[PDB]
Amino acid sequence: KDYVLFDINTKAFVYGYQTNAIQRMLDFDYVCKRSSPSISAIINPSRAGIHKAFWGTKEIILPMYKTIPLAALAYPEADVMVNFASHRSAFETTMEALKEDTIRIVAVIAEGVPERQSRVMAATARKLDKIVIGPATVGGMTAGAFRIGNTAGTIENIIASKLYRPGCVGFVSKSGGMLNEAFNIISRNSDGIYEGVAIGGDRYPGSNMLDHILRYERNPAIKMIACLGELGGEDEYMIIQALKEKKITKPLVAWVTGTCSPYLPASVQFGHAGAKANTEKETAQAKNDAFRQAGAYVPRSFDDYGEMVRQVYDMLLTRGIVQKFDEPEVPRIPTDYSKALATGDIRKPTTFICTISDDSGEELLYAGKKLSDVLDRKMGIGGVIGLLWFKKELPEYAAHFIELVIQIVADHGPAVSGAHNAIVASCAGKDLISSLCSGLLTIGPRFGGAIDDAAREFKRAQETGLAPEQFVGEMKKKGINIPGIGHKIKSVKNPDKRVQLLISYARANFPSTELLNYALQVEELTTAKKGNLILNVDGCIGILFIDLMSSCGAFSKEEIDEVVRLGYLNGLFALGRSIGLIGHILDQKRLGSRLYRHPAEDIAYMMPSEEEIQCK
Amino acid sequence: KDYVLFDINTKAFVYGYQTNAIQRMLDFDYVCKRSSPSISAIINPSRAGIHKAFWGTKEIILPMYKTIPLAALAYPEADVMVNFASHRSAFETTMEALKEDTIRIVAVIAEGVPERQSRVMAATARKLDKIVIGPATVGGMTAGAFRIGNTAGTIENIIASKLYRPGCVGFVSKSGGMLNEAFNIISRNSDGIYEGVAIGGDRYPGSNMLDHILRYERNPAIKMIACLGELGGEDEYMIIQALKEKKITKPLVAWVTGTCSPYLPASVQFGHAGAKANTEKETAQAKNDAFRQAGAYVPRSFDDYGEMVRQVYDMLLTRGIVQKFDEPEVPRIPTDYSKALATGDIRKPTTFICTISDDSGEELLYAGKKLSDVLDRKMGIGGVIGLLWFKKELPEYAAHFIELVIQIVADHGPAVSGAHNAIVASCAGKDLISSLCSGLLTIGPRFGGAIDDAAREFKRAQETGLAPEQFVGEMKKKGINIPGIGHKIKSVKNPDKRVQLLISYARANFPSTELLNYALQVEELTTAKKGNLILNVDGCIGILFIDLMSSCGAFSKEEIDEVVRLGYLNGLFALGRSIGLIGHILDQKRLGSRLYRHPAEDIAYMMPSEEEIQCK
Amino acid sequence: GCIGILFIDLMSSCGAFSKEEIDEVVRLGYLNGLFALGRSIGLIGHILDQKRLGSRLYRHPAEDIAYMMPSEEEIQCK
Ligand SMILES: CC(C)(COP(=O)(O)OP(=O)(O)OC[C@H]1O[C@@H](n2cnc3c(N)ncnc32)[C@H](O)[C@@H]1OP(=O)(O)O)[C@@H](O)C(=O)NCCC(=O)NCCS
Ligand SMILES: CC(C)(COP(=O)(O)OP(=O)(O)OC[C@H]1O[C@@H](n2cnc3c(N)ncnc32)[C@H](O)[C@@H]1OP(=O)(O)O)[C@@H](O)C(=O)NCCC(=O)NCCS
User: Fold this and answer.
1) Main-chain phi, psi angles of A134, to 5 degrees
2) Which letter, b or e, does each residue of A534-553 get, where b requires 16 or more Cβ atoms within 10 Å of its Cβ?
3) Which ligand is closest in space to the CA of residue B488?
4) Smallest CA–CA separation between C59 and chain A, in Å?
5) From the CA of A605, how many Å to the nearest CA of chain B?
6) Interface contact flag, C65 B395, Cβ < 8 Å
7) Rounded to an integer, what distance in angstroms lies between the CA atom of residue B107 and that of residue B16?
8) How would you class B168 by CB atoms within 10 Å of its CB: exposed for 0-12, middle for 13-18, buried for 19 or more?
9) How many angstroms separate the CA atoms of A536 and A526, rounded?
10) C21 touches chain A (CB under 8 A)
11) Range list of H helices, A168-268
12) What does UniProt give as the signal peptide span (chains A, B) (predicted)?
């Protein structure tokens, strides 16, 4: 019981939101034919909630807790914690898990944990009869029962190394990557591992190799012990002393890496924090020699490790210590979609097309132009709209016209429909965005819509060849006021400044103003009836926008008709009037304005009678 | 050349939106290493526009036209039309394509085309020196050059039958499915087909078998002819007469299916419209015998077809008529995502979870309950909300309470924020949906949100044990008016009917009204200050909804707190008040109401000074 | 991060805003408005782009949704 670290009933917490590691653990549980997942909960310090993962092809939900005590109280059956905290958090989180009465094993994955912190974790573990695997390890595994996080990599590797079923080998290493290579070596030269553990490469581990070797010595299922050490520190001398004191009776295969060291400078610090021979005793040579002399099976080099494994396994087969079992059913999990797509195994059709922007690359593109080029060239807001809406690099006069229109339509006081609705929502204590959309949703045929109608009606008259008099006459016959014509106060003698600013700019800077010249002929006729029948702001924008497009030269008659039809002009009004809408919402917020209720006397209540509401 | 039907430069129109058939054609062009796609445009009678498909792993755009004359004028280089119109439209569309000067070949896929219509198409084709393949065919193909729609199925089948490069065999059949089996037979017993055509199984085809056999006889690339006929009609007698008149000098393999017919009743009509032997001459026996006597290579049965093809191919090799080909590079296209997913080759994680409804199955489910069960049980609107919002089968008093609240809050006149904004949006000529949202976006802390506040504040006071006096006192100290308390006109002597209707129903029908009992103790205290400090409608809803949830018994204290926090109660107000909002919007539409502008005298303009707007 | 932080620096550079005035600007969501105004441009752009392309009605793919209906027992009131 004490010798068993993990079994098929082991339940664990995964500390840290490591979705791939979580999936790897579940995938192993599935291929091992486990009744339940090996994970009771995830500990996510940023967030409590749920996490969805696969159980084969079936999706399951795992609970997710902010703290170790909250998870432990909810899942007391979970006695293992897989700790993916960084080297900056590994100590505090391991110490907290070790203080929990229900947790027995903590696997510390982080590399770069101080030696002092590891010694304090190791001593805390020993005092409380608990186990710390790591720091700086992948963990380990019990074949066919449980895996620590990423131990033994892909499901393909688990299958190829026959890790879904136990063997007779008890394995322990310092290196994590070499633990996976060893799983492959051992499966090819024996019935495979029963259990494998990497203690990490730190000078002061949470648990020494001997701790695990002593558990393998007590386990009846294990008939063979195999270990892979390295230069630096005196850990392997605990094994050699135990081997000498007859504490390890099972045959032990042993190899210590770092035979390169005497050929190279004495100053060379190797990969693992603890891989540096300070004394001669700490060298790979002194260790391998002391292992040979203690009665362990030591190969000539790492190349003949598997062969020594093969020799020791064959000896157990002859003596009958190990019996030859039947290969269980080879398990199967479908390929992950993202792998199939990344390798080009599959092709997947796109649902959407996007021709205006691309955030996929090294740099954001607006209509194929890099954002840094848009800004280095001072294209301005008008230029950015040219790219994103018309897919054009507009000339300077066109981009400035767009920016002029935005300033001119920014606001027209609080009384208009849009500003009025935005103010009411703001007075109802709504946030800026809700209040803005409440205002924007009034923009249509009567508020902002005369821009499109003027562009539409004037373009058609001028195109179809109608003389201004004929257009004025036709519209009067149909009983339709000309869109873009008329003002309540402004007239020929008293002009609207917004109009004059727009017209003076186009006359001075537009290459062509053909629709404007026609519009001004129509205006001479309407002002001959009533002086206030001037070309208003909405008319001016729609008409000059057709002239801007005709001046660009890159738009056909059809393209221009499409621009009017699709409501690009309603968008320009919406974008500009957003400024004043946001302004009015914020203004009511600064003023601390109260809830609005329309005055009762401004409403004529005209209820239908009892007779009027009857069905007959 | 006249004998060539299709080559590697053939461009086509696909009449009918057959996305899979379009993809199949493009996939063949890709594996054949074609420079350009074999499709110039799609003809879609419902819609003009674009269609996106794959070119290997690269996505391309195909133009899409509403009519045949419009497509023909845009793409005059396209001389083939693949017609996927139904049997009800096949004639009119084929006739229109044949009248186009640029179209030479029309493949009619539809089954069930009248014999008169086919006769008229065939005669029209012969008069204009054009070709009609079909009706009731898949089409045919020139190996390594062009495929008609779905001819030869999957890309796996195209690869397995080596159809990506030509052979020496000129193939013609009546059957479409047997054309694909023949492609497989021939590839296994020769260098494969050069070209293959299925004329369809109709009694009066657009083109007879001999038309295609004569083309193969003129083509230098073809050294071998193979055909598969069937009983009924005298089509095969055109071949036998041409074989007798030495018009077919190339060796011809021939088999006529329908040898079963004399053993069965004379009344039996087989699959294909033309597969019924009216006379003895029309039988498979009379046809196979006349073929043998004419000098064709006729097998003993269909089983020996491949063997006959192998014999004729080998004879051409001995005489050096056929030269040995070197097998070109085997082409490769990735599997379609949907195939990989459907076969379980891949597993794909879902982005969303849905726990409230399911439209995937045989029948729509609301919280796992079939819609027909929801309606057969008369669960009502309140029951439907119970399922979709609370995931509960609510008791009758709870579901009726939800429906009562909806009626009570349906409207409160046009003057309130929500109705007021919807009316302004409707007066601006906006559609119902825009106008509705303009009004709904005012719903929050001051309009509708006193419901959620009354539930929250009263629940907390009553939970934490605060005596009503202590709650009234605490709120006064903080300077916070009690949410759900107070009315402008209604008082103790003159009550709000909406409140009275809600309180009376809860008192009479709720199992428990603990929070209402508390609220009434609070109300006695507030009305002791000012008579108008009554429990208002918003307070009533919030409080009674906590009591409803406590009466259900299936909600914990936490679940209830979650309901208050998530704003379920704002949703209920939104749902019910949408009725009156939609009502107001429609009312302004019926009245023909004009654009609203807020009166200028109702606004105090308080502009900052020049000094106030300066930055220091 | 860059926009929020530099906007506080812009206001401190103007000199006409007190610490309180600046806190009010952050509190009232002026910065959400600036984002809304700017991102409107690309939103209008994408809407018009789908209109030019003649894009069809979207329906989210069925396989991207995990349907997890509660049981008959789970929906009961007691
Ligand atoms: C007769 C009278 C009522 C007419 O009213 P009015 O304000 O001048 O103008 P209307 O409302 O008819 O509009 C003028 C024209 O502009 C047109 N118009 C209005 N808005 C327009 C628009 N946006 N686009 C195009 N045309 C427009 C109208 O269709 C109308 O055209 P029409 O004159 O060809 O029919 C007014 O001029 C009057 O009171 N005159 C005094 C008469 C008098 O002194 N009599 C003796 C008393 S003793
Ligand atoms: C003195 C006077 C101005 C007070 O005004 P009022 O209308 O009675 O009431 P208030 O505005 O103070 O509100 C009454 C209480 O209801 C409370 N209240 C209001 N809305 C509340 C709500 N929604 N929930 C809970 N408490 C609420 C207030 O906090 C206040 O509490 P308090 O009395 O404990 O401080 C008024 O009563 C008056 O004019 N009296 C005449 C005095 C007189 O005749 N003098 C001699 C003239 S010669």
Assistant:
1) 115, -165
2) bbbbbbbbbbbbbbbbbbbe
3) 2
4) 10
5) 10
6) no
7) 12
8) buried
9) 12
10) no
11) 177-189, 209-218, 236-244
12) none
DSSP 3-state of A254: strand
> What are the angstrom distances between the C-alpha of A245 and each of A25, A240, A241?
38, 9, 6
Distance B529 CA to ligand 2 centre (A): 7
CA of A503 to the centre of ligand 1 (A): 27
What DSSP string describes B351-390? SEEE-SEE-SSSS-EETTEEHHHHHHTT-HHHHHHHHHHH
Q: Residue B230 is inside which H or E element, if any?
A: strand B224-230
Question: Is C4's Cβ below 8 Å from some Cβ in B?
Answer: no
- Peptide bond preceding B135 in cis form (omega within 30 of 0): yes
Which chains share 3+ C-beta pairs under 8 angstroms with C?
Answer: A, B
Quick one: three-class SS letters along B35-98?
Answer: CCCCEEEEECCCCCEEEEEEECCEEEEEEEECCHHHHHHHCCCCCEEEECCCCCCHHHHHHHHH
- CB-CB under 8 Å, C68 with B391: no
**Pick from B297, B228, B235, B295: nearest CA to B258:** B228
Q: Classify A376 as helix, strand or coil.
A: helix
CA-to-CA distance for B538 and B448, rounded, in angstroms? Answer: 7
Task: Give the 3-state secondary structure of residue A501.
Answer: helix
Q: What is the DSSP letter of A502?
A: H
Backbone dihedral region for residue B391 (phi beyond 0: left; psi -120 to 50: alpha; all else: beta):
left
Q: Give the per-residue SS3 of A567-596.
A: CHHHHHHHHHHHHHHHHHHHHHHHHCCCCC
Please name which ligand lies nearest the alpha carbon of A488.
Answer: 1
Chains contacting A (3+ CB pairs below 8 angstroms)? B, C
Distance from CA of B611 to the nearest CA of A (A): 19
**Looking at chain B, which residue has its C-alpha nearest residue A431?**
B444
Declared resolution, Å: 2.1
Looking up tokens 């190996």 gives: B143
B615 touches chain C (CB under 8 A): yes
Report the distance separating Cα B254 and Cα B171, nearest Å: 10
Measured from CB, residues less than 6 Å from any atom of ligand 2 are B 476, 481-482, 485-486, 526, 529-530, 533
Q: What is the DSSP string of B120-152?
A: HHHHHHHHTT-EEE-SS---EEETTTEE-TTTT
The conformation of residue B397, written as its DSSP 8-state character, comes to H
Number of C-beta neighbours around residue C69 at 10 A: 18
CA distance A51 to A74: 16
Closest CA to B295 of B241, B256, B258: B241
| Cβ contact C11:C25 at 8 Å | yes
C-chain residue closest to B358, CA distance: C67
CB of A286 less than 8 A from some CB of C? no
The residues facing A65 across adjacent strands are: A43
Residue nearest to atom 6 of ligand 2 (CA): B530
- In angstroms, what is the span from residue B241 Cα to ligand 1's centroid? 91
Which residues are registered as beta bridge partners of A282? none
How many whole angstroms from A525 Cα to the centroid of ligand 1? 13
The closest-lying atom of ligand 1 relative to the alpha carbon of residue A486 is 23
Kindly list the residues from chain B whose CB atom is less than 8 angstroms away from the CB atom of residue C76.
Answer: 392-393, 554
Inter-chain CB proximity A52 and C66 less than 8 Å: yes
Establish how many alpha carbons lie within 13 A of residue B77's alpha carbon, considering only the half-sphere containing its beta carbon: 10
User: Residue B381 has which token pair?
Assistant: 């609107």
Specify whether the backbone of A330 is left (phi greater than 0), alpha (psi in -120 to 50) or beta: beta
Instruction: State the method.
Output: X-ray
Angle at B93 between CA B91 and CA B97, to 5 degrees: 115
Closest Cβ opposite residue C77 in set B350, B552, B614: B552
Distance, in Å, from the CA atom of A473 to the CA atom of A290, rounded to the nearest integer, reads 113
A272 catalytic, yes or no?
yes
Q: Which among B466, B591, B602, B453 is positioned nearest to B525, based on CA atoms? A: B466
